[PDB]
Amino acid sequence: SFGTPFERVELALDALREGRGVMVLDDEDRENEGDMIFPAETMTVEQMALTIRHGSGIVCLCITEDRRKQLDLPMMVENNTSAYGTGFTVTIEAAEGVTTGVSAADRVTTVRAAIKDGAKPSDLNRPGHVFPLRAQAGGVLTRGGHTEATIDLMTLAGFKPAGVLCELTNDDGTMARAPECIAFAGQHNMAVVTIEDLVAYRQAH
Amino acid sequence: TPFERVELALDALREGRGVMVLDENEGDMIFPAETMTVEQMALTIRHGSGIVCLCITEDRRKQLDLPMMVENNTSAYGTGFTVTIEAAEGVTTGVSAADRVTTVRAAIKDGAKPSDLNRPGHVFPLRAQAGGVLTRGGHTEATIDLMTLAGFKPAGVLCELTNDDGTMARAPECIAFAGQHNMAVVTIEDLVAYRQAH
Numbered sequence: 159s160f161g162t163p164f165e166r167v168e169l170a171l172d173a174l175r176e177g178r179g180v181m182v183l184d185d186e187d188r189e190n191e192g193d194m195i196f197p198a199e200t201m202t203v204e205q206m207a208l209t210i211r212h213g214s215g216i217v218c219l220c221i222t223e224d225r226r227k228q229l230d231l232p233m234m235v236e237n238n239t240s241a242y243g244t245g246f247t248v249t250i251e252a253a254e255g256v257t258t259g260v261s262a263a264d265r266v267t268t269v270r271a272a273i274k275d276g277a278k279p280s281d282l283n284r285p286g287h288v289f290p291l292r293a294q295a296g297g298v299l300t301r302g303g304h305t306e307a308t309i310d311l312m313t314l315a316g317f318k319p320a321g322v323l324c325e326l327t328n329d330d331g332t333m334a335r336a337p338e339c340i341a342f343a344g345q346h347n348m349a350v351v352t353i354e355d356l357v358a359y360r361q362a363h
Numbered sequence: 364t365p366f367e368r369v370e371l372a373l374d375a376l377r378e379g380r381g382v383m384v385l386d387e388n389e390g391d392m393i394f395p396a397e398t399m400t401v402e403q404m405a406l407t408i409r410h411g412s413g414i415v416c417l418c419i420t421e422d423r424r425k426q427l428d429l430p431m432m433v434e435n436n437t438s439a440y441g442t443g444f445t446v447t448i449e450a451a452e453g454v455t456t457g458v459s460a461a462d463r464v465t466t467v468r469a470a471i472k473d474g475a476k477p478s479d480l481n482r483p484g485h486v487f488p489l490r491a492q493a494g495g496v497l498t499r500g501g502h503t504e505a506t507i508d509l510m511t512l513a514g515f516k517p518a519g520v521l522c523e524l525t526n527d528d529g530t531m532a533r534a535p536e537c538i539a540f541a542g543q544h545n546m547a548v549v550t551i552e553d554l555v556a557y558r559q560a561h
């Protein structure tokens with residue numbers, strides 16, 4: 159890489175603000191993945207389209223524990239037995255403005271439905287094809303995962319604490335590793351930052 | 364004929380090729396869960412929604428303790444989503460073509476027990492309605508009936524085909540995809556008819 163943890167985080171924040179996305183890489187001894195993330199408020203149909211096309215296709219919406227209650231999306235399992243304690247809630251669908259809810263456009267509508275000011279639970283049907291992740295309070299200083307990094311990022315950048323995220327994926331079905339992600343981030347002018355970088359930053363500030 | 368199609372469908376599945384299933388207006392690559400290959404998975408992910416499901420019986424849903432995700436299912440289409448899964452091992456993050464395959468095999472394995480799968484995960488079990496396509500005409504049941512009429516366990520991996528531009532592949536496009544990857548094509552009508560006759 160290049161530069162300090164700190165300028166990478168600031169470029170990250172500019173990117174988001176600028177409508178560009180971010181590639182968030184994490185601990186090579188963890189997920190070892192990089193996530194294409196964008197703010198729920200700005201992510202374009204075109205962008206969502208590229209995330210379905212090059213990501214896992216399992217495109218998630220990072221939300222706060224406080225918005226989770228507002229929409230009343232129960233956590234998915236009470237005995238979350240998952241390796242990463244990943245914070246899946248019940249899945250969602252825009253209650254209208256969509257169809258099968260799986261096209262790019264439909265998922266963006268659903269994200270906007272979820273993030274709207276004054277968004278009420280009736281605004282969402284269940285189940286659906288957008289996957290909310292409840293970010294652990296204290297973000298990356300508490301839990302050091304993509305979910306948290308996202309919210310920490312929206313928050314610093316000045317947005318609502320809500321972000322779309324998805325794993326980069328080699329055409330062969332294997333996960334993209336660091337080198338791949340960074341070239342891809344390169345080609346799409348999304349700022350590369352790592353969870354190490356954001357934990358360094360928050361602490362510092 | 365609508366009946367030929369259904370037969371060539373089983374013939375594909377039997378041979379270990381995919382079936383394109385149309386009707387919703389969508390088009391779903393489906394493969395049996397007992398034969399689907401990684402490459403086969405990787406392609407599903409490459410051109411599918413990435414939301415790759417595994418259609419199962421209720422009896423199997425109970426065998427794994429996979430609760431229906433929401434009790435009040437307000438989904439526009441009454442979609443049979445269960446609480447999602449991940450192989451309790453053989454996988455890592457559970458999101459690669461190879462990891463998702465492994466998770467499917469863990470669930471459909473004879474004698475699979477609940478502890479064989481962690482929750483949440485990146486594979487989405489769909490529970491089809493008792494009665495098959497004669498009760499509910501969704502891709503969920505259309506896939507069990509298919510797997511069943513073909514000789515397999517009532518367990519099938521389905522996913523909706525999507526153009527690179529985010530727009531869902533429409534039937535012509537589906538039919539084109541079929542051609543490229545040598546899959547058979549049958550509709551839910553053809554398949555409702557078939558069971559009917561017989």
Ligand SMILES: O=C(CO)[C@@H](O)[C@H](O)COP(=O)(O)O
Pocket residue numbers: 189191193214216217218242244245291302303304305306323324325456
């Ligand atoms: O939910 C998903 C992907 O859809 C995750 O598995 C991500 O890869 C990152 O989530 P964290 O474990 O980092 O919170």
